[PDB]
Amino acid sequence: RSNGLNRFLMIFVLLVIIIPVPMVFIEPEINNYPDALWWAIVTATTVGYGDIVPVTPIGRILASIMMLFGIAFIGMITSTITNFFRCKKPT
Amino acid sequence: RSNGLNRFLMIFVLLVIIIPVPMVFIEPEINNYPDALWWAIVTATTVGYGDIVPVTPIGRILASIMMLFGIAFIGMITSTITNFFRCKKPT
Amino acid sequence: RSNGLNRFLMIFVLLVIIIPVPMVFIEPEINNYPDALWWAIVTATTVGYGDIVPVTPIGRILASIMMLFGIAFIGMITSTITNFFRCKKPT
Amino acid sequence: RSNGLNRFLMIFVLLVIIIPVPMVFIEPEINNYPDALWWAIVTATTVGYGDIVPVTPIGRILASIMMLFGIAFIGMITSTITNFFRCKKPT
Ligand SMILES: [K+]
Ligand SMILES: [K+]
Ligand SMILES: [K+]
């Protein structure tokens, strides 16, 4: 679907903005939103520097969701390119 | 195959649950199952924070399997999206 | 497009060369261009060792761009292979 | 090509075996082949724990090659799955 990419992008961007909020109050290593927002991208982009790591179960559970959405993001981006640069081959 | 995604998912989820078990008794850095379960996801999602790292050969051998299944997981997810959002183009 | 891969590659390679320049003068952990060039690849390849990590907001903003281009690079490489080894199936 | 996957796999596996050899004698953090072989996989699988990091230019140049082959490995695996589970859709 044409709105399929937009629907997955709006929910992914929403998480990378909302998930850092509880992470400030539940994690000791996370002491502010800019720090939490940074970690969320580092995790959702499947880069994982390790400079900010969740310790608490809830924090490690929320991190797991961000990783699962992180790999889904790559799959959504790769599909938006693989299906885009393949239709130009016949005509 | 329709059951092809399910067959790869049930064996992948099984490993992320079973592989953390020997990792507790063989690794010094891993001292419990929740810690081991956390590392398994961090590795299988190809994020790799480095907060928990295998030292022993067996632990580094089991980690290699988890990484090889980790990249295969992305390939399985990307294929389940690339082939899903391409069939809607003609009809 | 045939020049589509070249257009994305020339802008990606340009960033991995230009982005390390401000990173030397804005980050304390980055004290030279070879160090900065190394970090840029580690980030753009979505490997993320964590040996060099941005602290400053601007440095963490520039890093985010490099990560977003990093995942786009994998998507560009995977599409240049998935569409290349699929056209040889019928003829 | 049918032998296309085999040709890319035999050269990739060869590097993950040969590249760790100079890395022992050129890097201070790498003091043995099993340690070097471990780092090569961690890098070629684009996991990057950061437990073993190259310092020297040559070591950081060889690491860059391993990362470039690492992302190419994912692209080779994803293509071997995306084109495999798509031909079963019509017949
Ligand atoms: K990765
Ligand atoms: K990583
Ligand atoms: K990492």
The DSSP line for D32-84 is SHHHHHHHHHHHHTT---SSS---SHHHHHHHHHHHHHHHHHHHHHHHHHHTT
Contact B85 A83 (CB under 8 A): yes
| Total Cβ atoms within 10 A of residue B45 | 23
The partner residue sitting opposite A71, judged by closest CB among B34, B77, B84, is B77
Ligand 3 center–CA B42 separation, angstroms:
9
- How many Cα atoms are found within 13 Å in the side-chain-facing hemisphere of B55? 9
Give CATH for domain B1-91.
1.10.287.70
Contact B82, A79 (CB under 8 A): yes
State which residue of chain A sits closest to C71, comparing Cα positions.
A74
Structure solved via: X-ray
- Please report, for residues A10, B63, C52, the alpha-carbon distance to residue C75 in angstroms, rounded to integers and kept in the order given: 20, 26, 25
Contact B43, D42 (CB under 8 A): no
Resolution (A): 3.1
Compute CA C58 distance to the chain's CA centroid, rounded to the nearest angstrom: 17
Q: How many angstroms separate the CA atoms of D52 and D36, rounded? A: 8
Contact C77 D83 (CB under 8 A): no
Contact A4, B85 (CB under 8 A): yes
Q: How many angstroms separate the CA atoms of A5 and A11, rounded? A: 10
Ligand 2 center–CA A4 separation, angstroms:
27
φ/ψ region of C60 (left if φ > 0, alpha if ψ in -120 to 50, else beta) reads alpha
Contact A66, A19 (CB under 8 A): yes
Min Cα separation B7/chain C (Å): 23
Contact D90, B91 (CB under 8 A): no
Contact A78, B86 (CB under 8 A): no
Question: Which residues fall within 8 angstroms of residue C16, CB to CB, at 6 or more apart?
Answer: C37, C40, C41, C44, C66
Contact D42, B48 (CB under 8 A): yes
Can you spell out the DSSP letters for B32-67? SHHHHHHHHHHHHTT---SSS---SHHHHHHHHHHH
Q: How many angstroms separate the CA atoms of B74 and A72, rounded? A: 8
